[PDB]
């Protein structure tokens, strides 16, 4: 059908906007800025604004996770689109925050989140939507409980927005937007793309490997210096593909008594296989399986052997992918790179200046930046920096902003765990941080 499209990653960071190719909108007869009605899985719908995108495939639609969540679908799934000509300016909408996103937040909610979020934006909303509003170094989720023209409308300047009391509980299928996704990863476009390919069939179409006798990858080794976002990638790939995630921390395993280590490795692979499709992530692999000579222990050599055995003991394995992070290829036992094991490697390098910028935007999404803040500038003075450095930078900048305001606040009493929304991080804060 022409109205069926494949879900793809957003370029436009605004949660209300989905993107089509110029040709596709032509074909579907959709106006730039039109309100469209999206149909997903489990009888879910979403309403969004449609815009053209030059880079979008003709058969794909780009949407943010917020809308993917609302439609209960994942990247690569199929949605249907159709114009929404009947959509009315809403008389009144009722929204409530999800409890787990508003712990600690002692603000107005309406004045701090909702009012600025909706103001003059003409956002469409549908009853039962969860949307996200960022601010005050948090990101709060709200559920739309009622819209006056039901079940959807446009929040126009005259639309009354109600949020009368009592945060609501999170239902089971409602994944938190605080979960890691691809949108949380900057400057890895190329490698993240490879990893997604490798994993697509095994994790999203597992039934295939029962129907054919072709071998998908089993083990993927992510290498690169500390703080490059290897843990982040693995976690994200799991979340996005809806696979079960099992973390094995090198040091955590090695901290255990001889024997309770091997018992823990075993339990990890068993639990993965039980909950497949699944990803096992082995953080700090070199702690567990260092270069064959670097081990001096005898229990140490037994642990690495136990790991090789466990890798080999993964056949079709239902559909379990093992991902592991390490500093360098040569830091680990070469027997791990043997064929049935870690046979795929991906280099997560130091980010470039464009990547640095993406990372800086990711780690500032929930801050209020002054107008004088130039992230591209901060990008340019941080050549050596990896993701973890940049995140620390933004964190140091923000905490400096807070200290500057803290003497002022203590004196005219201590609003303290508030006023963090009116606070803005200035370029002076970043300079301060950049020289520390």
Cα 39–Cα 42–Cα 47 angle in degrees, nearest 5: 30
What token pair was written down for 224?
């690169």
- The reply on whether position 183 binds its own copies by CB under 8 A is no
Helix extents (H) in 338-386:
353-362, 375-380
CB of 108 to ligand ADP, least distance (A): 29
DSSP 250: H
Of the candidate residues 1, 42, 43, 296, the single one contacting its own copies (CB under 8 A):
1
- Number of residues binding to its own copies, judged by CB under 8 A: 53
CB of 225 to ligand ADP, least distance (A): 7
- Number of residues binding to ligand ADP, judged by CB under 6 A: 18
Q: What does 362 bind: ligand ADP, its own copies, none (CB cut-off 5 to 8 Å by kind)?
A: ligand ADP
Pairing of strands 78-83, 35-39: antiparallel
CB of 231 to ligand ADP, least distance (A): 3
DSSP 253: H
Of the candidate residues 216, 217, 227, 329, the single one contacting ligand ADP (CB under 6 A):
227
Residues 375-394 that bind ligand ADP (CB under 6 A): 387-388, 391
- The reply on whether position 187 binds ligand ADP by CB under 6 A is yes
Of the candidate residues 64, 147, 228, 426, the single one contacting ligand ADP (CB under 6 A):
228
- The reply on whether position 207 binds its own copies by CB under 8 A is yes
| 255-261 contact pairs (CB < 8 A, 24+) | 258/299, 258/302, 259/299, 261/299, 261/303, 261/306
- The reply on whether position 384 binds its own copies by CB under 8 A is no
Q: Is residue 239 within 8 Å of residue 181, measured between CB atoms? A: yes
Of the candidate residues 308, 318, 362, 434, the single one contacting ligand ADP (CB under 6 A):
362
**Quick one: angle between helices 230-241 and 189-204, nearest 10?**
40
Q: d(Cα 349, Cα 189) in Å, to the nearest integer?
A: 12
Residues 74-113 that bind its own copies (CB under 8 A): 76-78, 103-106
What token pair was written down for 43?
């009888």
Q: Tell me if residue 244 falls in helix, strand or coil.
A: strand
Our separate counts of H helices and E strands in the chain read 13, 17
Q: d(Cα 116, Cα 123) in Å, to the nearest integer?
A: 12
Q: d(Cα 34, Cα 157) in Å, to the nearest integer?
A: 18
- The reply on whether position 251 binds ligand ADP by CB under 6 A is no
Q: Tell me if residue 202 falls in helix, strand or coil.
A: helix
Q: Give me the 302-341 binding string for ligand ADP, x by CB under 6 A, dash otherwise.
A: -----------------------x----------------
| Positions at the binding site for ATP | 226-232, 327, 363
Of the candidate residues 232, 272, 336, 423, the single one contacting ligand ADP (CB under 6 A):
232
Of the candidate residues 252, 418, 424, 428, the single one contacting its own copies (CB under 8 A):
418
Spatial CB neighbours of 71, under 8 Å, sequence gap ≥ 6: 7, 38, 39, 40, 41, 44, 45, 46, 79
Q: Which residues bind its own copies (CB under 8 A)?
A: 1, 4-6, 59, 76-78, 103-106, 136-138, 197, 200-201, 205, 207-208, 210-216, 353, 366, 380-381, 391-392, 394-395, 398-399, 402-403, 406-407, 410-413, 416-418, 420, 431, 434-435
Binding residues (CB under 6 A) for ligand ADP: these are 184-188, 226-232, 325, 359, 362, 387-388, 391
């Amino acid at each position: 059908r022409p109205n069926r499209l494949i879900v793809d990653e957003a370029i436009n960071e605004d949660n209300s906007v989905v993107s089509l190719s110029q040709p596709k909108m032509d074909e579907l007869q959709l106006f730039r800025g039109d309100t469209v009605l999206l149909k997903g899985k489990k009888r879910r719908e979403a309403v969004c604004i449609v815009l053209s995108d030059d880079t979008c495939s003709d058969e794909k639609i780009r949407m943010n996770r917020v809308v993917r969540n609302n439609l209960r679908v994942r990247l690569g799934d199929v949605i249907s689109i159709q114009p929404c000509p009947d959509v009315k300016y809403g008389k009144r909408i009722h929204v409530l925050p999800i409890d787990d996103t508003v712990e600690g937040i002692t603000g107005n909610l309406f004045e701090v989140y909702l009012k600025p979020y909706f103001l003059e934006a003409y956002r469409p909303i549908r009853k039962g939507d969860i949307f996200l509003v960022r601010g005050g170094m948090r990101a709060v989720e709200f559920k739309v409980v009622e819209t006056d023209p039901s079940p959807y409308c446009i929040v126009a300047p005259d639309t009354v927005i109600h949020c009368e009391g009592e945060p609501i509980k999170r239902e089971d299928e409602e994944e938190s937007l605080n979960e890691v996704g691809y949108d949380d990863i900057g400057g890895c476009r190329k490698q993240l793309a490879q990893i997604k390919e490798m994993v697509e069939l095994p994790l999203r179409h597992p039934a295939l490997f029962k129907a054919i006798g072709v071998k998908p990858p089993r083990g993927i080794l992510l290498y690169g210096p500390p703080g490059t976002g290897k843990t982040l990638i693995a976690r994200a790939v799991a979340n996005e593909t809806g696979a079960f995630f099992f973390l094995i921390n090198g040091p955590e395993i090695m901290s255990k008594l001889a024997g309770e280590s091997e018992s823990n490795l075993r339990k990890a692979f068993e639990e993965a296989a039980a909950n497949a499709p699944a990803i096992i992530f082995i953080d700090e692999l070199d702690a567990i399986a260092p270069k064959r000579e670097k081990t001096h222990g005898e229990v140490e050599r037994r642990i690495v052997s136990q790991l090789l055995t466990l890798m080999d003991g993964l056949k079709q394995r239902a559909h379990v992918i093992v991902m592991a992070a390490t500093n360098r290829p040569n830091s680990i036992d070469p027997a791990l790179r043997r064929f049935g094991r870690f046979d795929r490697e991906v280099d997560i390098g130091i980010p470039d200046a464009t990547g640095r910028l993406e990372i800086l935007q990711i780690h500032t999404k929930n801050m209020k930046l002054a107008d004088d803040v130039d992230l591209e500038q901060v990008a340019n003075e941080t050549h050596g920096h990896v993701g973890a450095d940049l995140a620390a930078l933004c964190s140091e900048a923000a905490l400096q902003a807070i200290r500057k305001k803290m003497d002022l606040i203590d004196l005219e009493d201590t609003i303290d765990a508030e006023v963090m929304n009116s606070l803005a991080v200035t370029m002076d804060d970043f300079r301060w941080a950049l020289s520390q």
